[PDB]
Design an enzyme around this catalytic site. Structure first.
Site, PDB file in Angstrom:
ATOM      1  N   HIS A   1     -25.853  -9.885 -16.146  1.00  0.00           N
ATOM      2  CA  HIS A   1     -25.251 -11.204 -15.815  1.00  0.00           C
ATOM      3  C   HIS A   1     -26.089 -12.081 -14.892  1.00  0.00           C
ATOM      4  O   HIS A   1     -25.563 -13.004 -14.260  1.00  0.00           O
ATOM      5  CB  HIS A   1     -23.811 -11.073 -15.287  1.00  0.00           C
ATOM      6  CG  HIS A   1     -22.874 -10.411 -16.252  1.00  0.00           C
ATOM      7  ND1 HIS A   1     -22.074  -9.346 -15.899  1.00  0.00           N
ATOM      8  CD2 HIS A   1     -22.631 -10.645 -17.565  1.00  0.00           C
ATOM      9  CE1 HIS A   1     -21.361  -8.964 -16.948  1.00  0.00           C
ATOM     10  NE2 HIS A   1     -21.686  -9.730 -17.974  1.00  0.00           N
TER      11      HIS A   1
ATOM     12  N   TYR B   1     -43.910  -3.826 -20.984  1.00  0.00           N
ATOM     13  CA  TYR B   1     -43.977  -2.872 -22.065  1.00  0.00           C
ATOM     14  C   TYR B   1     -45.347  -2.229 -22.215  1.00  0.00           C
ATOM     15  O   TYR B   1     -45.433  -1.034 -22.538  1.00  0.00           O
ATOM     16  CB  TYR B   1     -43.450  -3.482 -23.376  1.00  0.00           C
ATOM     17  CG  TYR B   1     -41.955  -3.335 -23.539  1.00  0.00           C
ATOM     18  CD1 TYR B   1     -41.397  -2.217 -24.172  1.00  0.00           C
ATOM     19  CD2 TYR B   1     -41.116  -4.274 -23.033  1.00  0.00           C
ATOM     20  CE1 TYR B   1     -40.011  -2.080 -24.299  1.00  0.00           C
ATOM     21  CE2 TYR B   1     -39.724  -4.167 -23.172  1.00  0.00           C
ATOM     22  CZ  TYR B   1     -39.185  -3.078 -23.782  1.00  0.00           C
ATOM     23  OH  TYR B   1     -37.831  -3.018 -23.880  1.00  0.00           O
TER      24      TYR B   1
ATOM     25  N   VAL C   1     -33.693   2.990 -19.911  1.00  0.00           N
ATOM     26  CA  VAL C   1     -33.277   1.643 -19.514  1.00  0.00           C
ATOM     27  C   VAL C   1     -33.818   0.562 -20.470  1.00  0.00           C
ATOM     28  O   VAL C   1     -33.061  -0.345 -20.917  1.00  0.00           O
ATOM     29  CB  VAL C   1     -33.633   1.409 -18.000  1.00  0.00           C
ATOM     30  CG1 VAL C   1     -33.565  -0.081 -17.609  1.00  0.00           C
ATOM     31  CG2 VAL C   1     -32.657   2.283 -17.119  1.00  0.00           C
ATOM     32  N   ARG C   2     -35.104   0.640 -20.792  1.00  0.00           N
ATOM     33  CA  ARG C   2     -35.688  -0.343 -21.737  1.00  0.00           C
ATOM     34  C   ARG C   2     -35.310  -0.074 -23.225  1.00  0.00           C
ATOM     35  O   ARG C   2     -34.716  -0.923 -23.868  1.00  0.00           O
ATOM     36  CB  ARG C   2     -37.216  -0.455 -21.575  1.00  0.00           C
ATOM     37  CG  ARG C   2     -37.720  -1.272 -20.342  1.00  0.00           C
ATOM     38  CD  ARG C   2     -37.087  -2.743 -20.157  1.00  0.00           C
ATOM     39  NE  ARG C   2     -36.816  -3.472 -21.400  1.00  0.00           N
ATOM     40  CZ  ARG C   2     -36.218  -4.674 -21.498  1.00  0.00           C
ATOM     41  NH1 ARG C   2     -35.845  -5.327 -20.410  1.00  0.00           N
ATOM     42  NH2 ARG C   2     -35.990  -5.248 -22.706  1.00  0.00           N
TER      43      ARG C   2
ATOM     44  N   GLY D   1     -31.455   0.139 -24.277  1.00  0.00           N
ATOM     45  CA  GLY D   1     -30.964  -1.242 -24.198  1.00  0.00           C
ATOM     46  C   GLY D   1     -31.451  -2.114 -25.337  1.00  0.00           C
ATOM     47  O   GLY D   1     -30.652  -2.864 -25.903  1.00  0.00           O
ATOM     48  N   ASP D   2     -32.750  -2.034 -25.680  1.00  0.00           N
ATOM     49  CA  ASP D   2     -33.281  -2.779 -26.856  1.00  0.00           C
ATOM     50  C   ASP D   2     -32.524  -2.460 -28.127  1.00  0.00           C
ATOM     51  O   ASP D   2     -32.239  -3.381 -28.931  1.00  0.00           O
ATOM     52  CB  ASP D   2     -34.753  -2.444 -27.113  1.00  0.00           C
ATOM     53  CG  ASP D   2     -35.655  -2.870 -25.984  1.00  0.00           C
ATOM     54  OD1 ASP D   2     -36.775  -2.290 -25.847  1.00  0.00           O
ATOM     55  OD2 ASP D   2     -35.216  -3.776 -25.225  1.00  0.00           O
TER      56      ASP D   2
ATOM     57  N   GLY E   1     -30.020  -5.459 -28.439  1.00  0.00           N
ATOM     58  CA  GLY E   1     -31.164  -6.232 -28.865  1.00  0.00           C
ATOM     59  C   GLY E   1     -30.841  -7.073 -30.055  1.00  0.00           C
ATOM     60  O   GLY E   1     -31.431  -8.159 -30.210  1.00  0.00           O
TER      61      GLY E   1
HETATM   62  C1  LIG Z   1     -32.456  -6.108 -18.095  1.00  0.00           C
HETATM   63  C2  LIG Z   1     -31.261  -6.308 -18.605  1.00  0.00           C
HETATM   64  C3  LIG Z   1     -30.616  -5.200 -19.336  1.00  0.00           C
HETATM   65  C4  LIG Z   1     -31.143  -3.837 -19.598  1.00  0.00           C
HETATM   66  C5  LIG Z   1     -32.442  -3.178 -19.238  1.00  0.00           C
HETATM   67  C6  LIG Z   1     -30.026  -3.254 -20.365  1.00  0.00           C
HETATM   68  C7  LIG Z   1     -30.031  -1.904 -20.878  1.00  0.00           C
HETATM   69  C8  LIG Z   1     -28.992  -1.193 -21.616  1.00  0.00           C
HETATM   70  N1  LIG Z   1     -27.945  -1.788 -22.205  1.00  0.00           N
HETATM   71  C9  LIG Z   1     -27.230  -0.813 -22.806  1.00  0.00           C
HETATM   72  C10 LIG Z   1     -25.926  -1.006 -23.473  1.00  0.00           C
HETATM   73  C11 LIG Z   1     -25.202  -2.278 -23.664  1.00  0.00           C
HETATM   74  N2  LIG Z   1     -25.757  -3.475 -23.358  1.00  0.00           N
HETATM   75  C12 LIG Z   1     -24.800  -4.373 -23.690  1.00  0.00           C
HETATM   76  C13 LIG Z   1     -25.073  -5.822 -23.495  1.00  0.00           C
HETATM   77  C14 LIG Z   1     -26.324  -6.539 -23.159  1.00  0.00           C
HETATM   78  N3  LIG Z   1     -27.458  -5.844 -22.965  1.00  0.00           N
HETATM   79  C15 LIG Z   1     -28.396  -6.766 -22.699  1.00  0.00           C
HETATM   80  O1  LIG Z   1     -29.618  -6.439 -22.490  1.00  0.00           O
HETATM   81  C16 LIG Z   1     -27.951  -8.178 -22.668  1.00  0.00           C
HETATM   82  C17 LIG Z   1     -28.745  -9.420 -22.372  1.00  0.00           C
HETATM   83  C18 LIG Z   1     -26.523  -8.001 -22.998  1.00  0.00           C
HETATM   84  C19 LIG Z   1     -25.509  -9.077 -23.114  1.00  0.00           C
HETATM   85  C20 LIG Z   1     -24.566  -9.047 -24.035  1.00  0.00           C
HETATM   86  C21 LIG Z   1     -23.549  -3.768 -24.267  1.00  0.00           C
HETATM   87  C22 LIG Z   1     -22.279  -4.411 -24.768  1.00  0.00           C
HETATM   88  C23 LIG Z   1     -23.839  -2.323 -24.249  1.00  0.00           C
HETATM   89  C24 LIG Z   1     -22.973  -1.156 -24.682  1.00  0.00           C
HETATM   90  C25 LIG Z   1     -23.625  -0.478 -25.883  1.00  0.00           C
HETATM   91  C26 LIG Z   1     -24.046   0.967 -25.634  1.00  0.00           C
HETATM   92  O2  LIG Z   1     -23.609   1.601 -24.647  1.00  0.00           O
HETATM   93  O3  LIG Z   1     -24.844   1.486 -26.462  1.00  0.00           O
HETATM   94  C27 LIG Z   1     -27.782   0.535 -22.561  1.00  0.00           C
HETATM   95  C28 LIG Z   1     -27.228   1.827 -23.086  1.00  0.00           C
HETATM   96  C29 LIG Z   1     -26.012   2.179 -22.252  1.00  0.00           C
HETATM   97  C30 LIG Z   1     -25.695   3.606 -22.616  1.00  0.00           C
HETATM   98  O4  LIG Z   1     -25.315   3.850 -23.773  1.00  0.00           O
HETATM   99  O5  LIG Z   1     -25.854   4.515 -21.778  1.00  0.00           O
HETATM  100  C31 LIG Z   1     -29.001   0.281 -21.768  1.00  0.00           C
HETATM  101  C32 LIG Z   1     -30.028   1.258 -21.265  1.00  0.00           C
HETATM  102  N4  LIG Z   1     -28.984  -4.056 -20.572  1.00  0.00           N
HETATM  103  C33 LIG Z   1     -29.286  -5.212 -19.971  1.00  0.00           C
HETATM  104  O6  LIG Z   1     -28.489  -6.219 -19.966  1.00  0.00           O
HETATM  105 FE   LIG Z   2     -27.587  -3.800 -22.084  1.00  0.00          FE
END
Ligand SMILES: C=CC1=C(C)/C(=C/c2[nH]c(/C=C3N=C(/C=C4\NC(=O)C(C)=C4C=C)C(C)=C\3CCC(=O)O)c(CCC(=O)O)c2C)NC1=O
Ligand SMILES: [Fe+3]
EC number: 1.14.14.18
Length: 207
Positions: free
Chosen positions: A19, A47, A125-126, A129-130, A134
Site C-alpha cells: 500500500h 533482479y 519475497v520477489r 509475489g511475482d 504479477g
Molecule cells: C514490493 C511489494 C510487494 C512484494 C514483494 C509482494 C510479495 C508477495 N505477495 C504475495 C501474495 C499476494 N499479493 C497480493 C497483492 C499484491 N501484490 C503486489 O505485489 C501488489 C502491487 C498487490 C496489489 C494488489 C495478494 C492478493 C496476495 C495473496 C496471494 C497469495 O498468497 O499467493 C506473496 C505470497 C504470499 C504467500 O503466499 O505466502 C509474496 C511473497 N507483494 C507486494 O505487494
Molecule cells: Fe503481493
C-alpha cells in the site's frame, strides 16, 4: 510449516509495501508508462543482483529444487526495457536509487557469503509475489496505460504452464527445506527485511 510462518511473519511488512503511495498510484491508473518504466529499470538492477545470489546458492547445493532457473527475470526485463524505452540507451542512463543501492548491497553480501537461508527469504519475497500478484500488475499496465503485452515479459513466466500448481509446489518445497532453528530465524528476519527494502524502493520512486 515454513510457508505459513513466512506468510504470517511478513504480513505486516507485505502490507506496508503493497500500500505504498507509488504502487497504489501506479495500479489505480494515476501515473503512466514512464513511471512503470522507471520501476522496471530499478527492478532490473535488483533482479540482476538477486539472480547472482540465487546462482551462488544453487551452485552450493542448497534449496536446489526451489531455485528453478525458469524464474530468472533479469533477461526478460532487459528485453521489456528495450521495448519500453525504444532502444538500449537505458543501460547507460539508469542509476540505482538509494533504496536499490541498499537492497543490491544486501543481495551481494548474501551472494558472497553464499547465505542459503537469507537468499531463500529474498527468493520467496520477489518470486512468489511475482507469481501471485504479477498478473494483476500486468493487467493494470495494459488496462490503465495501454502497455503492450510484449513489454510485460517480466510477468509472463514463459516456461511455466499451470501456475497455481507451481505455487503450491513452491510452498511444499519451502516446507521441506532442512533448517536449524538458527537458520529458520535468520530466514524469517531476512524476509521482513526484503519487504522493507522493496517498500523503500517504491518510496524512492514516489520521490
Ligand atoms: C514490493 C511489494 C510487494 C512484494 C514483494 C509482494 C510479495 C508477495 N505477495 C504475495 C501474495 C499476494 N499479493 C497480493 C497483492 C499484491 N501484490 C503486489 O505485489 C501488489 C502491487 C498487490 C496489489 C494488489 C495478494 C492478493 C496476495 C495473496 C496471494 C497469495 O498468497 O499467493 C506473496 C505470497 C504470499 C504467500 O503466499 O505466502 C509474496 C511473497 N507483494 C507486494 O505487494
Ligand atoms: Fe503481493
Amino acid at each position: 510449516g515454513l510457508a505459513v510462518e513466512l506468510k504470517q511473519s511478513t504480513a505486516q511488512a507485505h502490507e506496508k509495501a503493497e500500500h505504498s503511495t507509488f504502487m497504489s498510484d501506479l495500479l489505480k491508473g494515476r501515473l503512466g508508462v514512464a513511471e512503470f518504466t522507471r520501476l522496471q529499470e530499478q527492478a532490473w538492477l535488483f533482479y540482476t543482483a538477486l539472480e547472482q545470489a540465487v546462482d551462488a546458492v544453487r551452485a552450493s547445493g542448497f534449496a536446489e529444487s526451489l531455485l528453478d532457473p525458469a524464474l530468472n527475470r533479469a533477461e526478460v526485463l532487459a528485453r521489456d526495457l528495450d521495448k519500453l524505452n525504444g532502444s538500449s540507451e537505458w543501460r547507460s542512463r539508469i542509476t540505482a536509487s538509494p533504496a536499490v543501492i541498499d537492497y543490491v548491497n544486501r543481495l551481494e553480501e548474501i551472494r558472497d557469503n553464499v547465505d542459503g537461508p537469507a537468499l531463500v527469504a529474498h527468493h520467496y519475497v520477489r518470486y512468489l509475489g511475482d507469481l501471485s500478484g504479477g498478473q494483476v500488475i500486468a493487467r493494470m499496465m495494459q488496462r490503465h496505460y495501454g502497455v503492450d503485452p510484449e513489454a510485460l515479459g517480466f510477468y509472463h513466466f514463459e516456461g511455466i504452464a499451470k501456475l497455481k500448481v507451481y505455487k503450491d509446489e513452491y510452498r511444499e518445497k519451502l516446507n521441506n527445506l532442512e533448517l536449524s532453528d538458527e537458520q529458520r530465524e535468520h530466514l524469517l528476519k531476512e524476509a521482513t527485511d526484503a519487504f522493507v527494502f522493496n517498500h523503500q524502493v517504491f518510496a524512492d520512486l514516489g520521490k
